[PDB]
Amino acid sequence: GSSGSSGDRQFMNVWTDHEKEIFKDKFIQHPKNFGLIASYLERKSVPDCVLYYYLTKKNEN
């Protein structure tokens, strides 16, 4: 990983590995806090991450 910013100029709106890692990184510290986890992920919003929490915690009751 030498080249920092290769390009990816195209607008890509999809949860990527890099993102996921961040979603959890903070979660551990400030769990149940979408206000922060979102602050870091500018590309994403507050009410945008709240969903993920469910997706990962979606079971059949």
Side-chain angles (χ1 to χ4, degrees):
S2 181
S3 277
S5 59
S6 188
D8 273 89
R9 57 201 273 175
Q10 273 31 283
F11 285 78
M12 290 275 181
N13 278 100
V14 55
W15 278 98
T16 61
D17 292 272
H18 303 319
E19 295 278 275
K20 296 163 179 272
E21 280 170 73
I22 296 158
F23 177 101
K24 191 187 191 183
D25 271 36
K26 281 86 183 151
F27 191 88
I28 299 155
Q29 278 82 52
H30 284 283
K32 278 189 277 191
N33 204 83
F34 304 127
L36 198 75
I37 306 191
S39 168
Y40 276 96
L41 301 154
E42 62 182 310
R43 296 286 209 63
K44 302 287 173 203
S45 202
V46 148
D48 278 38
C49 289
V50 76
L51 287 153
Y52 190 99
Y53 162 69
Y54 281 68
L55 280 283
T56 304
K57 273 271 274 89
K58 170 203 168 185
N59 275 329
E60 196 288 321
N61 198 6

